[PDB]
C-alpha cells in the first residue's frame, strides 16, 4: 500500500493511529477499522463514527491507496452504572464489580470487561446461560454517560453425564480420577476448567478440549464432553554391542509413564559388559488410595570393576497431597557400598581418616565397605499449565536424606530444584524461563559426607558446553600417571580429574521463541531458545593451609559461565535436546565441549 490517509483526525497524530495498523487485504482493513474504532472508544469518544472508506488503485494497477474518513467527538465521562433485572441474589458481588471511579473517562472496553465479569460471576453458581446486556445513555448538556446493565440470570443447570472421547488406551478411571465436576450435581463453570487443567498437567495427551452440550428436550441439564488426543508414552530399547575387543556387550530397558494405560510409572533397565554390571527396577502407583496417596519404590545393583566399586540397595517411598498444588513424600532406603583397590589421594583419605581408617600412602592395596540405612523425605510444588512445554506457573522440588542412627555413615544431604516461566506475548509464543538448582550436604558427629555421594556439575543437563561432571575440584594425588606410585614423581601432583564437592549452585536464564520458519506439522513439537547459564561447585573442609601451594577449593566465588543456543524436539521416539555454547568464562582444567546432544 503506497499511502494510508486518515481524514478528520485532530486529537492524535496520524502516525500514532497508523502505528496500530496491520496493513503497514480485506481482513487487515477490517482489523484496522475495528482497531481505530476501539482506540477512540477507549478514550471517551462515545460518538466516534467511521464515515467512509475509499480503496483505489493507481493507473495500470501499479499501486494502491487507502483513505478512511472519520468524525471525532469529545471526551465523555462515566457518571455511574445502573444495574437492573433478575439477580438471583449476588447483588453485592455485582455491585462490587459495578464500582467505578467518579468521573472516570468513559471506556468501551471497561464496559465489556464488567459485562464479562458478571457472566463469570454467575457461571460459578450454576447459571450457565444468563442474558446480560448493557447500553449507554449519552448526555448532551454535559460530557457524561450513564451506563445501564440489564441482567437476567435465567435458571440453574445440572450435569447429567460426563463423557470422554479419544480414550483409546487409557482406562476411563485414569481420566476420570482427575475431575472436579461430579455427575448429578449442580454445574460450576470453574470446576470444569480445573478438570481441564489437571488433565493437561499429567502430560499424557497432546490436547484436551471440552464441550458443554444442552440435553435435547430438557431446560436445565447439560452433558460435558472431554476430547483428548493421546501421545506415545515411553519406549522399549534393546541392543547388543558384541566385538572381539570386548566380547559380549548387552543393554536393554523400558520406560513408560503410563503402562498399558493403567497409570503406573514403570522403569526397568539393565546392562552387562566385561567390566560393569548394572540393573534397576522402579515401580510407582500414583493412586494407592482413592484420595491420591501414591506408593512406589525401586531396587538397584551396580558392579563396577574398573578400583572396585560394588553396591546395591532398595528404596521405598510413600507420598500424599496436602493441597491442590502441594504434595509431601517420605520413605526409607538401604545401601551397601564396598570399595577396594583405591588410588591414594588427599580428598579421599581425609574422609577415610575421619572414619578411623589408616591406609598406607602410595600402596593402592586397601578396602573399605559400609552398610547404611537412610531416611528420605521431600516436598513438591507444581502449578505448571502443561506437561510437555509449560508456559506459565512454577515448580519447586525440595528433597533430602538423613542417615538413620545405627548406620556406618552419618550425614545429611539437601537439594532444591526450581523453575519459573513467564510469557512475553499473549499467545505464549514468546516466553522467558528461569531455572535454578541448589544443594548442600555435610557430616554429623565428626564424620564427613562419603565421597560417593558428592555433587557434580557440568554437562548438557546442568551447565551447557562443559564435559559432563567436569566442573569443580580436581584430585590431588599422593606419590596412568607415574605420580600415582613411587615410580613417578616424588611429591604431590595435581590433575584434571573432577571429583565433585559438598556444595553446588547452578542457574540459567533462557529466552524461548517460536521457530523462525517451520511448517505447521512441527508447530507444537519443536521449540527453540537462547540461553545464558552459570554455576559452581565447592568443597568445604578443604585444608587451604596444609596445601596452600595448591588452588584453594573452598572458595565458592570461582563461578563458571556459558552461553549459547538450543533446540528441543518431541520426536515421535522421545524428547531430544540439541545445544551449542561457548564457555567464555572458564578456569584451569575446565575441559570444554561445545556441541552437545542428549535424549530427554
Amino acid at each position: 500500500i503506497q499511502q494510508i490517509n486518515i481524514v478528520g483526525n485532530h486529537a492524535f497524530t496520524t502516525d500514532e493511529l497508523i502505528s496500530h495498523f496491520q496493513l503497514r487485504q480485506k481482513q487487515k482493513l477490517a482489523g484496522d477499522l475495528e482497531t481505530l474504532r476501539s482506540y477512540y472508544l477507549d478514550r471517551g469518544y462515545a460518538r466516534f463514527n467511521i464515515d467512509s472508506t475509499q480503496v483505489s488503485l493507481t493507473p495500470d494497477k501499479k499501486g494502491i491507496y487507502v483513505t478512511v474518513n472519520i468524525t471525532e467527538g469529545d471526551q465523555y465521562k462515566l457518571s455511574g452504572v445502573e444495574v437492573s433485572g433478575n439477580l438471583a441474589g449476588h447483588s453485592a458481588e455485582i455491585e462490587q464489580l459495578t464500582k467505578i471511579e467518579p468521573g472516570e473517562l468513559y471506556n468501551g472496553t471497561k464496559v465489556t470487561k464488567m459485562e464479562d465479569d458478571i457472566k463469570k460471576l454467575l457461571g460459578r453458581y450454576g447459571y450457565a446461560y444468563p442474558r446480560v446486556q448493557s447500553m449507554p445513555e449519552i448526555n448532551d448538556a454535559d460530557k457524561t454517560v450513564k451506563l445501564r446493565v440489564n441482567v437476567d440470570a435465567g435458571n440453574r443447570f445440572y450435569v447429567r453425564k460426563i463423557r470422554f472421547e479419544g480414550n483409546d488406551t487409557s482406562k476411563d478411571a485414569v481420566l476420570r480420577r482427575e475431575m472436579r465436576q461430579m455427575e448429578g450435581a449442580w454445574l460450576g463453570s470453574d470446576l470444569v476448567d480445573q478438570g481441564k487443567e489437571r488433565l493437561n498437567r499429567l502430560g499424557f495427551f497432546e490436547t484436551v478440549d471440552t464441550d458443554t452440550q444442552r440435553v435435547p428436550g430438557s431446560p436445565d441439564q447439560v452433558d460435558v464432553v472431554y476430547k483428548v488426543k493421546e501421545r506415545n508414552t515411553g519406549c522399549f530399547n534393546f541392543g547388543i554391542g558384541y566385538g572381539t575387543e570386548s566380547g559380549v556387550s548387552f543393554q536393554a530397558g523400558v520406560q513408560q509413564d503410563n503402562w498399558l494405560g493403567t497409570g503406573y510409572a514403570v522403569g526397568i533397565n539393565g546392562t552387562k559388559n566385561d567390566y560393569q554390571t548394572y540393573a534397576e527396577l522402579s515401580v510407582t502407583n500414583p493412586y494407592f488410595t482413592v484420595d491420591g496417596v501414591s506408593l512406589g519404590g525401586r531396587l538397584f545393583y551396580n558392579d563396577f570393576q574398573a578400583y572396585t566399586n560394588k553396591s546395591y540397595g532398595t528404596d521405598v517411598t510413600l507420598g500424599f497431597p496436602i493441597n491442590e498444588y502441594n504434595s509431601l513424600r517420605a520413605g526409607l532406603g538401604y545401601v551397601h557400598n564396598s570399595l577396594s583397590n583405591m588410588q591414594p589421594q588427599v580428598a579421599m583419605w581425609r574422609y577415610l581418616y575421619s572414619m578411623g581408617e589408616h591406609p598406607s600412602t602410595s600402596d593402592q592395596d586397601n578396602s573399605f565397605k559400609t552398610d547404611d540405612f537412610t531416611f528420605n523425605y521431600g516436598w513438591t510444588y507444581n502449578k505448571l499449565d502443561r506437561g510437555y512445554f509449560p508456559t506459565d506457573g512454577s515448580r519447586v522440588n525440595l528433597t533430602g536424606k538423613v542417615t538413620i542412627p545405627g548406620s556406618d555413615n552419618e550425614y545429611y544431604k539437601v537439594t532444591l530444584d526450581t523453575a519459573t516461566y513467564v510469557p512475553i506475548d499473549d499467545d505464549h509464543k514468546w516466553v522467558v524461563l528461569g531455572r535454578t538448582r541448589w544443594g548442600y550436604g555435610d557430616g554429623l558427629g565428626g564424620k564427613e559426607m562419603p565421597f560417593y555421594e558428592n555433587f557434580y556439575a557440568g554437562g548438557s543437563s546442568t551447565v551447557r558446553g562443559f564435559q559432563s561432571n567436569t566442573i569443580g575440584p580436581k584430585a590431588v594425588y599422593f606419590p596412568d600417571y607415574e605420580c600415582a606410585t613411587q615410580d613417578g614423581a616424588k611429591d604431590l601432583c595435581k590433575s584434571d580429574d573432577a571429583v565433585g564437592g559438598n556444595a553446588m549452585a547452578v542457574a540459567s536464564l533462557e529466552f524461548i521463541t517460536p521457530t523462525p520458519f517451520i511448517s505447521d506439522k512441527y508447530a507444537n513439537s519443536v521449540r527453540t531458545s537462547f540461553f545464558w547459564d552459570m554455576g559452581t561447585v565447592w568443597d568445604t573442609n578443604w585444608d587451604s593451609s596444609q596445601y596452600s601451594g595448591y588452588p584453594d577449593y573452598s572458595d565458592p566465588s570461582n563461578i563458571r559461565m556459558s552461553a549459547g543456543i538450543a533446540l528441543q524436539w518431541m520426536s515421535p521416539l522421545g524428547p531430544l535436546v540439541f545445544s551449542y555454547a561457548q564457555p567464555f568464562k572458564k578456569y584451569d582444567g575446565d575441559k570444554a565441549e561445545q556441541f552437545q546432544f542428549n535424549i530427554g
Binding site: 506415545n232 515411553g234 519406549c235 530399547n237 541392543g239 554391542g241 521416539l573
Partner: peptide, 28 residues
C-alpha cells in the same frame, strides 16, 4: 509404508543391523 543395513517399519519402530551393533526401538 516400509522404506529402507538398516530400515524403518513405521512410526514407533526402528531397527538397525550395521563386531555388531544390532538394535531396535519400539515405542508404545
Amino acid at each position: 509404508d516400509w522404506k529402507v543395513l538398516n530400515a524403518e517399519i513405521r512410526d514407533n519402530v526402528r531397527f538397525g543391523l550395521e563386531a555388531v551393533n544390532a538394535n531396535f526401538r519400539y515405542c508404545f
